[PDB]
Amino acid sequence: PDDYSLTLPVILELGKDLSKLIQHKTKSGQSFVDDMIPKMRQALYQDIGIRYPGIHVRTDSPSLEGYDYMILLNEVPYVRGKIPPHHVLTNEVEDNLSRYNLPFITYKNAAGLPSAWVSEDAKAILEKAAIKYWTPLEVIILHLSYFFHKSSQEFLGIQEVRSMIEFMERSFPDLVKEVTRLIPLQKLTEIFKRLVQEQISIKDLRTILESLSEWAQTEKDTVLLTEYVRSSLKLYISFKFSQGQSAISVYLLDPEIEEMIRGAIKQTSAGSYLALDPDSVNLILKSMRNTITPTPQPPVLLTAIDVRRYVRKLIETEFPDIAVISYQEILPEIRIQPLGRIQ
Amino acid sequence: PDDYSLTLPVILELGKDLSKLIQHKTKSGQSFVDDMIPKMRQALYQDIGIRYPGIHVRTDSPSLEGYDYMILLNEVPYVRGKIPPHHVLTNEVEDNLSRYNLPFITYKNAAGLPSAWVSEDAKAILEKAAIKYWTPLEVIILHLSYFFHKSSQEFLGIQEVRSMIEFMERSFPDLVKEVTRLIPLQKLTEIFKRLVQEQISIKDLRTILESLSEWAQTEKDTVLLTEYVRSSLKLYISFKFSQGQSAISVYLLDPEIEEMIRGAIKQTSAGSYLALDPDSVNLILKSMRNTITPTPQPPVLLTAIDVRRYVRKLIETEFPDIAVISYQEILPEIRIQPLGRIQ
Question: Which residues, by range, are in coiled-coil regions (chains A, B) (predicted)?
């Protein structure tokens, strides 16, 4: 009646028609709310450390267009989106679609999503040309998943990290003890947050904790401890950023740029930051814009060990999805296919 | 659901046909999952001082061909492999097989494993000729064993070392009490890990603990404690690297090299550095390359007591499998056969 209520972390509101739409089942007899959304949460938990909250679905939204949907983060609207009626979504090129495929509607719901919508009546031909397509419900799932991917910091806090560490305690009481006797819980969560901010999964807790148990005996800096955990994930990072190929394809930095960055460190009374020379930062960004070819996959930038974290923070603003990795973080025997040298 | 899952250390994924294959007991009635894998684990735990994890077997994998298999370390793919259909593996010289009118398929699954595959129809012939062969299931076990051996450090951490010390506590309460009173669990874990990192078995926990119980009264450096444990395993080391003969075959160092290494940074830093000139490290590495005739078993490099650990930390990157031993680790009556110094 008049107790407090906890704010709901994620709301999905649907217009009258999409609400009418979540009543069917896919050709595989699965439910949007009981199967598709849980499987998305499960996939996200496998892709990075986080166990993301459930999705509260509000049907027949009054403030919504029947074919519109809205995502609310902590009961505040985060993103609106639209579904072109009676279509399926596609990721096809603009010269390939000039293969008599009439519906070339471009409407981008989000950055990381496809935008080439095609009539549902064309499913048959889409399946005959090896064109993958997403049904409108699957597009909603794509967008929810993208949302979770870009906003991990919103769902990985002190309580959530503690819950995962406690689960670890059941079979690793002594490793956790050795990890809780050196790094207090708040510092631990800061470290996990830095990891997932750069798409480093924190799912392999035994590896990460074993790493911290080693490096936390000597170093207390949370940023450095994070670097070490990264260097502990050689197999994972190599497999992820090489996309499972025999060779990681990366961009490099001209040694001149690296040494120039190296010469901009700070005194670490509190922390050591980048003494970003304005004009030099805008010159490195310009060389990156004019060297890294745009993408459909995000590109990978391989740098020296001692500058990687700085390169990330120098570039994270314009190139937020570019992965900056270091030699300390790839397998010793890994094949490297250089693509360019930023100058 | 809402709950976490513990990452699986070892997954073996099998295509359709290999999956069918593990459903049949061998000629002698043993099961791939119930007998072969357990016995391999027991053997590894008999050679190295590690208890290796169980293997989770995923059949009818979607991403694998009928005769393909994959090994995942902590749910990241480690390696992929093939089995030539309806064949058995042999180590025969290819030219000899040809001379026996036996068509052969060449395929090397992992480093140091045989590669001459022969139709299973040839078993009888191979038996009468006393030619060794491995069935497909046996080859998967061979590759699994190579994997576990290369990945030992992945299974030897704080919780696992604690588990060992626990088992030791049941019959050696006071010896454990003496060692753990002097060495914390994390330091103990470091020492065991150093031992297996250089192929020294930690199966004889009584000898290792007794050694530590003696030397931890006086010495706290974990590296020096490790050296002492190494010298306490004289019998094990002599038998292993002499391969059981009345004489160990070794390479030696020039007195000039030993004296030159002997300039080593030993500060009060819980472990001493080794400050040798870069070009000098490259001159010792060059002399080793030009003096170590490659091996068809690994070679042994015999050094003086006070330089052994440094010699290792100097050659381990380019010469990773060379066993570096000292006069302190071999039996006094084991005859030293010298294969030339290092210029």
Answer: none
